[PDB]
Assembly symmetry: C2
Homo-oligomer: 563 residues x 2
Amino acid sequence: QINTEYAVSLLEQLKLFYEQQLFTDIVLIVEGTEFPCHKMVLATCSSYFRAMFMSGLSESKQTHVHLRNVDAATLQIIITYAYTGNLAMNDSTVEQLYETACFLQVEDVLQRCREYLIKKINAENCVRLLSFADLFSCEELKQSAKRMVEHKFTAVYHQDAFMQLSHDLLIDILSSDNLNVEKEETVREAAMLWLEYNTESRSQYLSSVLSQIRIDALSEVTQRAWFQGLPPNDKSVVVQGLYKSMPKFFKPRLGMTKEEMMIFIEASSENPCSLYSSVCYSPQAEKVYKLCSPPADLHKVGTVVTPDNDIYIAGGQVPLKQTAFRTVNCFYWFDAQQNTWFPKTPMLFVRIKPSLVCCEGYIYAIGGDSVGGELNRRTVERYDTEKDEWTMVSPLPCAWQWSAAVVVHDCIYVMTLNLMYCYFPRSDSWVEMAMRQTSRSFASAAAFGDKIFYIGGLGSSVTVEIYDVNKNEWKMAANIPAKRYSDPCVRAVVISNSLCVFMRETHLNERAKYVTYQYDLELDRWSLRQHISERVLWDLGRDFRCTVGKLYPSCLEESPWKP
Amino acid sequence: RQINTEYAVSLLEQLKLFYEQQLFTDIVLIVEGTEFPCHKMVLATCSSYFRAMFMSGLSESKQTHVHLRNVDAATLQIIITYAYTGNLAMNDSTVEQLYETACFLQVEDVLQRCREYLIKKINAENCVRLLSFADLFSCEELKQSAKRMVEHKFTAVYHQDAFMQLSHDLLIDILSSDNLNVEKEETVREAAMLWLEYNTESRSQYLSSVLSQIRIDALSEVTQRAWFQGLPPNDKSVVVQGLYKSMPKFFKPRLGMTKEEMMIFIEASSENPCSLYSSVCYSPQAEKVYKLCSPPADLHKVGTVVTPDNDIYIAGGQVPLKNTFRTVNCFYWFDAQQNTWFPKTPMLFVRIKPSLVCCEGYIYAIGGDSVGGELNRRTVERYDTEKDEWTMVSPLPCAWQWSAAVVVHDCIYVMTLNLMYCYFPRSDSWVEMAMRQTSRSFASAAAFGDKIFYIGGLSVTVEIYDVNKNEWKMAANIPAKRYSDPCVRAVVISNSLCVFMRETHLNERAKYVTYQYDLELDRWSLRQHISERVLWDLGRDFRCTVGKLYPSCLEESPWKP
């Protein structure tokens, strides 16, 4: 191999020459700023300077080149990267950095900024990044922007930059089958408002934008509104659209295929070659669709589903390369369509079984057997979904183990064996709450409306303690009627605007039975909503978690397994 | 920060590619008609002369073609390719010209690399040549190393052709130094004379200077008559100046005369509990116990060998892994004056307690757990003291453990439990020899005269073998106290066969005593009893070998009687 010591010595000597200006022969003249540099470094880094000097043109012998349509700071950072390899990339100058990299055709900085932008893609810059990837040919960025823009924009459709988009880009966006919309009318009104941004600059594109939307809205309202905005005496558009909506037979999209499903993680692996797996139950389809494995079989993790219906994974441990397990603070995000886990910004401290709770767009991970264990062994930390970073919050006053947390009334409610503390995001403080009369642990709670339903606790039992936020008191309702001499595995969840329970029971010398019940809020009784047949759902285990979310049956595949 | 992962390797490789394609070049070097297009930046960053060649404002700074002379084409090409790729790939022949060109071009890195290569390759013959080379081009490290090597070897050769052509200052430094490894004072006198006989009437003043340098002890023997035979005619004041060098200039004894025949011991009972083993020495005549520095200071289970030129070598050994005994094939050599250990070319197999045998100037390592898992478990490997390399030879006939090997009549002899094979260096083959009637192991043999004396084994078995007769016979039993396990050590002392044995009983202290053995008497006469007031306990795995050492360079071992 090439001697790295001599390579770094040569590089540092060249950078010293650059700083001291000894062997510089070519100077870059940009907006009156002198940039003394060498030809060898520029040729090695950029693919434009190699065609600027070794070309035989008038600049081959000229020692002063007036490089135009560039920026001084961008050129300076590119030159210093070419001379030392350090590329300091902030969150603002990456746009002009990519512009100058494309202008100068430098592959290394182009790849680096492409990776930075593939990491930086978020909701508030999705349309801007897609427009940037349309301006400069970049297929990876274009595809990532396609996916993220489709999802987040069809969720939001309010960005100001969406109005200033090319016709081809909008045709690609609207005609795609990856849009995430609960209805087919929101895309219609989004297209209408985009068209009405201008009057005559969009008339020619009117015949094309309607060609990608289904005819179910091409004969109903929002056709006379276009006639109102039609240019005067234009008889080539009204009669055109009058007899035009014959083709494009109505085909349902993919965004209207989200159903309230119970996502399960760390289920019992069917094949003994793997430790655990992830499955999902369909309360409506009455089937069990398989889910992608956790990233690097990440066990002992926590789940959260934001009001925007997004799944996240935090904490967990990976078997170190017989008992062998090491805890890692890696963070991941689940793609609802690609059926894969996209990595995100990792946490600061590793966790085991963390309680992920979403509130005000922030992901809160409370506790989880942190590595530190100092006097603040109860330190909790939130995540920024806008800036893609983690921020510490007010620590929990008391150290708790095997706890659960929910969000009610824009506040974080973490529950332990007998104590409860409410966190105020506005003031970053903890307030003492009501005290339970029973010592129970290893249970889960579901936030339904303005009440907290702590179900089960210790196997578990059928004890239920209902807490009211407005009343600040713990009261008993009833006990779930289950078979005696059994060990039910209770799982509290909210579904169909009602509090249902996923309770798996096992009898003596008998296999586990799956059945869910609907708890009557006013009657204080668990009614049999549906019985899960064992012909579709097999054993899941004991350390499995359940959460409420929506998934697409089309993108996912049915799990092939014998009843 | 110098990021070595992406840019450094890529930048260096692209610069090399640009050099290959003759791209972006602006300076070309003319060397006796050969053209070397290159770049100014690489020459500036590598050589400390090209930076002044292209930066200092003169007529050659703005000069597309430069005619650089007094430089070899191949050396400049290899320097340029080293600057463009970082790899030197130096041979053993073009080192002198490469170093000369590096010194002319002031390229510090390649200068240091060549200095290390030259200081590692002062083997046997280029010592005076590279000493003169270092005198021409000032190099303190090379100068000192070559001076020590010359003081060690030229004092035994003093006939090298290159030694005749030396500058006066270097010769004065060599001769006036008190590091001459000569047991007699006339050899240096005749060396100086022969250095002043081939070049006479040209260095007459330097002749007088060297005459004064050699001093009275050798000046009063023959030099006057030889000079009278060889003096130029009509020289009178030269007689006056030569007659003056009889009384003055501090006649003092030399250092090479102190070649006392002693015994080098390894793996002794360390005094400080922090250390495990130590290497010490014993003086048969001075009746003193000297110490030596451990070669690795941490590795043990080494083997010793002594060449006829009184040199000490250490090969193989095992060292603890120091995790939070691994075998190492390293090699070392003991300095007779610096009391240190300079490493040499390592072996190819990690041996445990190798048996090194010297013959025909070559070091032969026989057995000693080569790798253990060999397809042919019975193999050997020798050493070249001149070429400094390891050469594979014909393997062992049979696989043996705890064996011993000696050299007799320029022939390799290895002894095992009951078998013995003679290895012919000329034909590189093993010939079957006589078989012992007694099966004894864990013993060593001594090569005294033309007879091999295999002593001990499990005892006091004295089996004498003769090469000319090819037979094994018994002589007697060494007188040792009963209820004891003697530790026998057979070695040559002052051209007389003697033994060094220690007896240990129950609830009794060890006693050290050496006896004088006679060939025709078959008796070990009491020669000298080693008093415990000067020598302490050694141990069980200690080894003994015969060699000459310097008392002044070494240090006495402090121990309470």
